[PDB]
C-alpha cells in the first residue's frame, strides 16, 4: 500500500546483503568497507542493478541443457492448453510455476530483488502494473523510475533475435498437405523442476517416509506411498551445475527420468526345459511376470462381488495377460535350438513338445513333421488351464455362488482363443 514500507524493505535487503558480504570478506583494513558501502548501500546499487537485469533472463524453457557450447534464444512462454484429451505438458503448470534464471552467476542476487514479498505479492507482478506505490518506492525521479521499471521487467521478455543454435535439436514434422515445420525443442526446466519436486516429496518426504515405516512395521496408515523404481540420472553440468541454470543449481544435475521401458527390457535368458515334467508348472510359471499375475489372480479370486462384473472384466483382462505370456514364452522358444525336443530323456513333457519346438518339423522330414499337422495340438492349453486351475483360490464361497461359473466362462473363452491360436501354427 504505502511506498515507505517497500523502501524500508528494500533498504533492509541491501543492508542485509552489505553485512553478509562484510562478514564474508572479514575486512579490517585496506579501505574495503568504504568500497563495499560505496556501491551496495544506496540507490546507485539499483542503478548497478540496472546493469545486472539486462544480463539475466527469467525463462521457463531453456536450450543450455542441450550442448553447453550452444548459444540460442531461451524463451519464457506458457504453452496453450491442448483441446485433445489425455496428454500433459508444461501447460498444466498454472500457479505452481517456478521460473528459471539464466545468465551470470553474480547478477543472480537481483533475482531475489525481483522475488521478495513486501506487500504480500511478487514484485514482478507489482511492476507489471502501474500502481500508486510503484515508481515512487524505488526512485524519486519519474524518468529514472520508468527506465528502472522497464529494465527490471525486461528480465521476462526474451532478448535478441529468435534463434536456435546448430548444437540444438531441430526436427522436421510432416504437415498433412505438402509441408514441414522445423520445430526446435527447448528443455522444460520449470516442468522438470516440478516433476523433480513431486518425486522428492514421493521418495524423501516426511509423510512418504512415515508410510514406508508403516509398511515396514506392517501397520495401518491414513495414506499410502510410492517407490518409483528404475529411475535414471542425467547430470547436465559436468562439474559446474550452476553454469547450466539456477534451477539446475538447485537440483545439481539429476534430471530424474521416468522408466519408459518395454516389458522385454530385462530379458534374462532362454532355457530349454529338458529333464522336467510340465512346462507351465516348472519353468514357465517361475518367471516373475506370470508370478505377479498368479498372485493377482489369487488376490482377485477371493473378493467381494460388489463391483463383480467390472472386476470380472478386469479379471478377464488379467487372465488374458497370462495366456499372452504363454505365447510370449513360446515366442522365445522360437529363439532356441531347432532340435532340442529330439534330445534323449526319460521325461521331457512330450505332450507339449509339438508346440514347444515348431522347428523340429524342419529337422525331421516325416518322423515328426506330419505329426503336428495331423494332430493339430490345441489341447495343451487345457493342460495349461489345469495349471491355471491352480491359480484360483480354494474358497467354497466362490464355488457355491456364480463366481465360479463366471470364472469357468471366462477361462473357457480365453482357452478357446488360446486353442484357436495354437491350431493354426502350421501356416
Amino acid at each position: 500500500p504505502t511506498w515507505q514500507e517497500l523502501r524500508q524493505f528494500i533498504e533492509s535487503f541491501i543492508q542485509e546483503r552489505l553485512q553478509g558480504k562484510l562478514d564474508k570478506l572479514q575486512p579490517d583494513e585496506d579501505d574495503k568497507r568504504q568500497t563495499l558501502l560505496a556501491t551496495h548501500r544506496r540507490e546507485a546499487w539499483l542503478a548497478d542493478a540496472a546493469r545486472r537485469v539486462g544480463q539475466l533472463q527469467l525463462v521457463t524453457h531453456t536450450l543450455k541443457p542441450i550442448h553447453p557450447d550452444a548459444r540460442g534464444s531461451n524463451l519464457h512462454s506458457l504453452p496453450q492448453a491442448p483441446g485433445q484429451p489425455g496428454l500433459a505438458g508444461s501447460h498444466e503448470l498454472g500457479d505452481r510455476l517456478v521460473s528459471d534464471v539464466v545468465g551470470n552467476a553474480a547478477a543472480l542476487d537481483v533475482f531475489k530483488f525481483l522475488s521478495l514479498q513486501y506487500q504480500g505479492k511478487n514484485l514482478l507482478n507489482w511492476l507489471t502494473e502501474d500502481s500508486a506505490e510503484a515508481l515512487q518506492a524505488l526512485s524519486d525521479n519519474a524518468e529514472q523510475a520508468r527506465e528502472w521499471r522497464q529494465a527490471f521487467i525486461g528480465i521476462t521478455t526474451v532478448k535478441g533475435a529468435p534463434a536456435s543454435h546448430s548444437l540444438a535439436k531441430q526436427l522436421y514434422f510432416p504437415l498433412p498437405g505438402s509441408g514441414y515445420h522445423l520445430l526446435a525443442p527447448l528443455f522444460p526446466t520449470s516442468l522438470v523442476h516440478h516433476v523433480h519436486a513431486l518425486l522428492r516429496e514421493a521418495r524423501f518426504g516426511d509423510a512418504a517416509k512415515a508410510a514406508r515405516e508403516a509398511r515396514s512395521r506392517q501397520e495401518s496408515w491414513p495414506h499410502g506411498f510410492s517407490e518409483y523404481p528404475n529411475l535414471a540420472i542425467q547430470k547436465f553440468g559436468g562439474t559446474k551445475p550452476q553454469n547450466i541454470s539456477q534451477l539446475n543449481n538447485e537440483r545439481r544435475g539429476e534430471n530424474w527420468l521416468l522408466p519408459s521401458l518395454p516389458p522385454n527390457w530385462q530379458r534374462q535368458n532362454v532355457n530349454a526345459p529338458m529333464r522336467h515334467s510340465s512346462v507351465f508348472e516348472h519353468d514357465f510359471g517361475r518367471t516373475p511376470e506370470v508370478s505377479r499375475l498368479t498372485r493377482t489372480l489369487q488376490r482377485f479370486l477371493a473378493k467381494t462381488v460388489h463391483n463383480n462384473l467390472a472386476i470380472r472384466q478386469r479379471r478377464a483382462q488379467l487372465v488374458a495377460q497370462i495366456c499372452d505370456e504363454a505365447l510370449q514364452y513360446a515366442a522365445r522358444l522360437r529363439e532356441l535350438e531347432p532340435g532340442w525336443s529330439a534330445t534323449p530323456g526319460c521325461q521331457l513333457h512330450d505332450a507339449e513338445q509339438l508346440w514347444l519346438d515348431p522347428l523340429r518339423a524342419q529337422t525331421d522330414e516325416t518322423f515328426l513333421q506330419r505329426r503336428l499337422r495331423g494332430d493339430w495340438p490345441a489341447e495343451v492349453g487345457n493342460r495349461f488351464a489345469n495349471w491355471l486351475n491352480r491359480a484360483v483360490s480354494s474358497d467354497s464361497q466362490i464355488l457355491g455362488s456364480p463366481e465360479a461359473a463366471q470364472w469357468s466362462q471366462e477361462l473357457s473363452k480365453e482357452l478357446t482363443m488360446f486353442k484357436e491360436i495354437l491350431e493354426d501354427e502350421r501356416d
Binding site: 515405516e213 515396514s216 512395521r217 506392517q218
Partner: protein, 76 residues
Amino acid sequence: MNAIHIGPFSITPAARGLHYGGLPHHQWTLYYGPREMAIKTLPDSYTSSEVRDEFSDIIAEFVIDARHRYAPDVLE
C-alpha cells in the same frame, strides 16, 4: 566412529578401516545383544542417520519376524 544404540540393537564399527574403491570404509556390525545379524561395509563419510538407514531394513525384518513369532493366540 561410535556405536549406534537402537533399543536392544547396537551398531558397532570395526576399529580397522579399509579403503574399498578409493574412499575409506569401515565394517559396521549390527548386534541384537550377543548375536550379530548384518555385517556391512560402509563409508566413513556416512553420517549416523545413513548407517541407521542401511540396517533399518534388517531391523524392520527382525521386528516383523518377532511380531509373527511371539504373537498371542486368538480365540474365536
